[PDB]
């Protein structure tokens, strides 16, 4: 199971990086991305806990970047980024100082060696036509993937998003957006991709 969107006490999650990696293994998550808001501070302690505890969990370094597009707050997740790259650190420092554009987020992620993901597209409450414009804009500026699967989701939304991703030659991501234990969100829960779209992890696995 891949869960490529989660938070820790480094941003607005309630669990430490150490508690989260253990929760992921208990939930039978095989690959976990930590994607804290505008910080990578949880990655190094999470890796340390996986090693010290002998966990069989692949940690994907990630971040969730806050952007603005056409006056809408839009979140872009970077996956498999190099968290020590000076441009990434500078960019995140500018983010916590203050937003930036979608294209600017994508460029920093790519320069850091990662893949850019349009996060939770259904949450922006856009009409079908404006969601299409957002996705077309994201793809036009070299975005790589879009989150297709979430924990709380009608089957219709998931297949609509997968078709929208495929339409623009984007890969699909999946993530719980876990912040704290609660009824409606759990690490790995109900995350799978429908047929007709490939997972974003292909872009670094091969
Ligand atoms: Mn959050
Ligand atoms: Mn978000
Ligand atoms: Mn999030």
Author numbering: 9 to 106, 177 to 284
List sentences quoted exactly from the publication behind this structure.
RNase AM is so far the only 5′-3′ exoribonuclease known in E. coli, the enzymatic activity of which has been shown to be essential for the processing of bacterial ribosomal RNA. RNase AM belongs to the PHP domain family of proteins which is composed of amidohydrolases/phosphoesterases and is present in some DNA polymerases. To test this, we assessed the deFADding and deNADding activities of a recently characterized 5′-3′ exoribonuclease in E. coli, RNase AM (yciV), which can hydrolyze short RNAs of up to five nucleotides with a 5′P. We were able to expand on the original observations and demonstrate that a 40 nucleotide RNA molecule can also be degraded by RNase AM and further demonstrate the exonuclease activity is processive. Intriguingly, RNase AM also demonstrated robust deFADding activity, but unlike the two eukaryotic nucleases, RNase AM did not hydrolyze NAD-capped RNA.
To gain insight into how an exoribonuclease could function as a deFADding enzyme, we attempted to determine the crystal structure of E. coli RNase AM in complex with FAD in an effort to elucidate the mechanism for RNase AM monophosphate hydrolysis and deFADding activities. However, no crystals were obtained for RNase AM alone or in the presence of FAD. The final structure consists of residues 9–106 and 177–284 and is modeled with three manganese ions (Mnα, Mnβ, and Mnγ) and a sulfate molecule in the active site. The refined atomic model contained no RNA and has excellent agreement with the X-ray diffraction data and the expected bond lengths, bond angles and other geometric parameters. RNase AM has a distorted (β/α)7-barrel fold and a three metal enzyme active site composed of histidines and aspartates/glutamate residues. Mnα and Mnβ, which are proposed to coordinate the water for nucleophilic attack are coordinated by residues His13, Glu72 and Asp255, and Glu72, His83 and His198 respectively. Mnγ is coordinated by residues Asp20, His45 and His257. The sulfate molecule coordinates all three metals and forms a salt bridge with Arg201, which may stabilize the hydrolysis reaction intermediate. Comparison to the CV1693 product complex containing AMP and Pi shows that RNase AM has the same overall fold and active site architecture, and the RNase AM sulfate is in the same position as the phosphate product.
